[PDB]
Amino acid sequence: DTKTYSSTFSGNPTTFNYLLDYYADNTAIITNLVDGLLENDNHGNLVPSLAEDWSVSSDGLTYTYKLRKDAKWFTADGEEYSPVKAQDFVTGIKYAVDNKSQAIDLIQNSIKGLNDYITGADSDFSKVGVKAIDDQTVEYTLARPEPYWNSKTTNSILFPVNEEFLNSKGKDFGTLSPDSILYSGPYLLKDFTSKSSIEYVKNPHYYDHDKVSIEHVKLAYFDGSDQELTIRNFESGAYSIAGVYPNSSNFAKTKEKYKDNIVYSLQDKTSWYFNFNVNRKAYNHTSKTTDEQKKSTETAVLNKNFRQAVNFALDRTAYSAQSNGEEAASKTLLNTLVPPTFVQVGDKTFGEVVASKLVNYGTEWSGINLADAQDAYFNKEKAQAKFAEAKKELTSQGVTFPIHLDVAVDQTSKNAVTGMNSVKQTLESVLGSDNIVIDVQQLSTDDFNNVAFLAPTAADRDYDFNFDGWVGDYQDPSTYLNPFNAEDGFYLKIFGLDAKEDKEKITSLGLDTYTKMLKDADRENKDVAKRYEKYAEAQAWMIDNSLIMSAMSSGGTASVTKVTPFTRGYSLVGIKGDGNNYKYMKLQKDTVTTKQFEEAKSKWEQESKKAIEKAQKEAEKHVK
Amino acid sequence: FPPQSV
Ligand SMILES: [Zn+2]
Ligand SMILES: [Zn+2]
Ligand SMILES: [Zn+2]
Ligand SMILES: [Zn+2]
Ligand SMILES: [Zn+2]
Ligand SMILES: [Zn+2]
Ligand SMILES: [Zn+2]
Ligand SMILES: [Zn+2]
Ligand SMILES: [Zn+2]
Ligand SMILES: [Zn+2]
Ligand SMILES: [Zn+2]
Ligand SMILES: [Zn+2]
């Protein structure tokens, strides 16, 4: 019926500890079970959640939230545990900070006194700027004004937690058991079974239950190997939605039956990219047979000309053409970590300012165009010219050619294997097989996670070259650039680098320069455009030095669905505005037509801009 | 934050 959403999930959640872990595989579940202060409407605005009202002081340093009194904690079986109280938000911050939360960078230098508490300069948590004024009133005091602070509250590190429940659970809080957490969101977790099934049930006593349409959400684990019978399960009526893959063995019959139902998503908040390992130590998944090969590859990835040569030879259209259509491949393309229209800088977009900083860095960037839905980088002649310069400097260091680059892939996901094999075919043909060889290491899902995506330390990452992403956490360009800073960036590990042990290689690469540019940008809090311009300079550094090679965004791909379009929560940042938030999602009996979808998108476009204007003006009513 | 399905 319209009350049951049935689909698939492909991630491997590892923990429901929403205060210590902020990997999306986990928070995509948590967002339906735990509410924060605010959430997102279907237009992208921030709207009340647990907080029914809020205020900010004139100096922008004090944010006060009023908790609605019918906000309650429930156990997994649905029984009420306790009303949510403002002290639960103080407990959340202290627990997340005392246990070195993965997401600690979002609050460490923003909440007043928190950095002094973290470093041990002052161990009195009463001096930290989070307080419970009474049971319904929580107050955050900041180190500096942050217009994006309210957007930060849609991340789970800023979610509340009951202190009595946390202390009695102790070590057993936030495991993979539904009984390891308390529930304050629209749904209860009926069942989780790893690599099998997820089931939600609507919470009848949730304060906003009258807005929750879908009563049951059933997700079955999907490897990504049989891209087919998801469409057959959609035909059966077993599934509410099914992706359609043009490179499947039956797309011909699938297209002619669903010709009027195939719809394409929008580009959303995930920024995808390729990156090098510049400090590889683990060598358990490699086609290299000798030290000379390993020494050669290690020196090559540290050469700027080599990285630019690979960057200019990587055809992003071909990589996207393997999963999506050969025509539809260009829809997903993205050339920056910060979306080019994420912010405006005077009369310029962010991407336009980045390109203006980029052209001043070298003639290899003249004419650069970082717009969406097109490949800014691919250029065979500049790739070959860069590699010729790289080849002459690497031979002086005793580097043998061809260079072997390892890239690890999930063997079971056919999209990833064929995509990485297209990068192999492109890079080997543009640069020459006598100059570079791409060795695609097909690993099991567990194995790939053990040595790449979920590798415990930076020295455990077993590759020379990888494909990863990042989701915006708050409304500021720093959210896409801070993760790669060499002081405390959470994603510094993907380069194989550790902030303490690898400081001379960090300086050798110029990552100290990049970190200082971000620190220089972060000090700008009165002139917001100047702040954006200085983050644009840092984005230009990352593009030019080619440790990161931006590729595409999520979304922009094809599917057939029974989900009524543009009803779910929507956001550019946070965990409360993506396709995993079922609260506002609505289902229909008939399959969505391309006519219905494109008309809804047009009106959603109009109504969102009108709604965003009104919410920006209404927000001034809260400055009291 | 780190992405899904990667
Ligand atoms: Zn009841
Ligand atoms: Zn009701
Ligand atoms: Zn039911
Ligand atoms: Zn050896
Ligand atoms: Zn340069
Ligand atoms: Zn030269
Ligand atoms: Zn040598
Ligand atoms: Zn920092
Ligand atoms: Zn200015
Ligand atoms: Zn300027
Ligand atoms: Zn509306
Ligand atoms: Zn208001």
TrEMBL record, chain A:
Residues given in the record as Zn(2+) 7 binding sites: E533
Binding site for Zn(2+) 4: K304, D544
Family: Belongs to the bacterial solute-binding protein 5 family.
Naturally occurring in which organism (per UniProt): Streptococcus pneumoniae
Binding-site list for Mg(2+): D191
Binding site for Zn(2+) 3: H285, D447
Gene that encodes it: aliD
Taxon lineage: Bacteria, Bacillati, Bacillota, Bacilli, Lactobacillales
Gene3D superfamilies linked: Dipeptide-binding Protein, Domain 1, Dipeptide-binding Protein, Domain 3, Periplasmic binding protein-like II
GO BP terms in the entry: peptide transport; protein transport
Protein name: AliD
